[PDB]
Paper text:
[name], an invasion protein from the facultative intracellular pathogen [name], is a multi-domain protein that binds and activates the human receptor tyrosine kinase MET. The N-terminal internalin domain (amino acids 36–321; InlB321) is characterized by a central leucine-rich repeat (LRR) region that binds to the first Ig-like IPT domain of MET with high affinity. The LRR region is flanked N-terminally by a helical cap and C-terminally by an Ig-like inter-repeat (IR) region. The B repeat folds into a compact domain resembling a β-grasp fold.
InlB392_[name], an InlB392 variant with a single Thr-to-Glu substitution in the B repeat, readily yielded single crystals of varying morphologies in several conditions from the commercial MORPHEUS screen and a homemade PEG smear screen. The best crystal from condition D3 of the PEG smear (low- and broad-molecular-weight) screen (crystal form II) was a rod with a cross section of about 35 × 35 µm and a length of about 180 µm. This crystal diffracted to 1.8 Å resolution. The packing of InlB392_[name] crystal form II is different. The contact area is between 397 and 647 Å2, with a mean of 549 Å2, according to the PISA server. This crystal contact is not present in crystal form II of InlB392_[name]. The largest difference between these distances is found for InlB392_[name] crystal form II. The crystal structures presented in this work provide additional and conclusive proof that the [name] mutation does not change the structure of the B repeat. Therefore, the negative effect of this substitution in cellular assays is most likely due to the destruction of a binding site, preventing the interaction with a functionally important binding partner. Secondly, the contact between the B repeat and the IR region is formed regardless of the [name] mutation.
Numbering used by the authors: 36 to 392
The structure:
Amino acid sequence: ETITVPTPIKQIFSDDAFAETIKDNLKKKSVTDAVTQNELNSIDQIIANNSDIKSVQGIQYLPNVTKLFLNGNKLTDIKPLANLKNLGWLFLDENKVKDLSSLKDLKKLKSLSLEHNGISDINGLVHLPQLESLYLGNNKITDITVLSRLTKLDTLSLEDNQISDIVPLAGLTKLQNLYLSKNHISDLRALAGLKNLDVLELFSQECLNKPINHQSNLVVPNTVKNTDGSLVTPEIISDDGDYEKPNVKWHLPEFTNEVSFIFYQPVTIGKAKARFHGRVTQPLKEVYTVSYDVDGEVIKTKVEAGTRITAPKPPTKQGYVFKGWYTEKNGGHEWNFNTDYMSGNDFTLYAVFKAET
């Protein structure tokens, strides 16, 4: 990964924009000018934000780079960085870098910024336990399991992601600055022990429950918990609902596809003050009852309106053959389970049988 003769910058740095970056760094007149390994060895820092760079191919010839500012470019592959053993500060905001495995051998990396990169999988960060600052805001992260190994972090931004489980943070007692706004957090117990926090942000938590059936009298557990595990009393409840601790209750005489409640809780951890504020959203399914009538005996099943009914195993009546399920007793329309949709009301389907042939 070295040049042994004078070589044009453009020959090493194949991305035309990155080549211009090196030319300017070395105070050269043209990307056709030849450079030497000694000149490449002299580069300690590259500042090339918002420079339309698609590839840093060639950077592997710069063994002594310690600081790399590459925010606002068009990068995807960062494999050319893999062996920059002295890299200490890496800023890659607003690119499309997802393959964090290229970082695994950067054991002197102290600060890593990867905001707005579309990242969901950060498991590659397990190989960087020495990190002190990590910026991952505005991504698509759900699973931060790996962060329990990053016991040297004092600054961690996970804001604007999709995180609900923050238990992996519970042991990171060195944290001083923790940005968690715009996630899916409903349970703050994981934060209780972070006694060194100076800055904490917990605004705008959007918590989505799995759908349940609509009912006239609905009950949903309050799942919002403070650092001590106690329930946060709702600030306001949709659809004229009420709080009967520990449950939220509604009377819903007409179907609606959602109820919700909002919560607000001032939080103090260490020296940090925060406002835990968010909404719990409960989707509701519009369900009615299909009654299967088999010669006067009934089995009931609940089905969501506007969906297809899954036909039951057909009845077996000694001496007869099952014909089908019909909308009237001894007559009507034969239900077609592949084309007829569940209606917006309870109704009965009647088993009709026919003679053995």
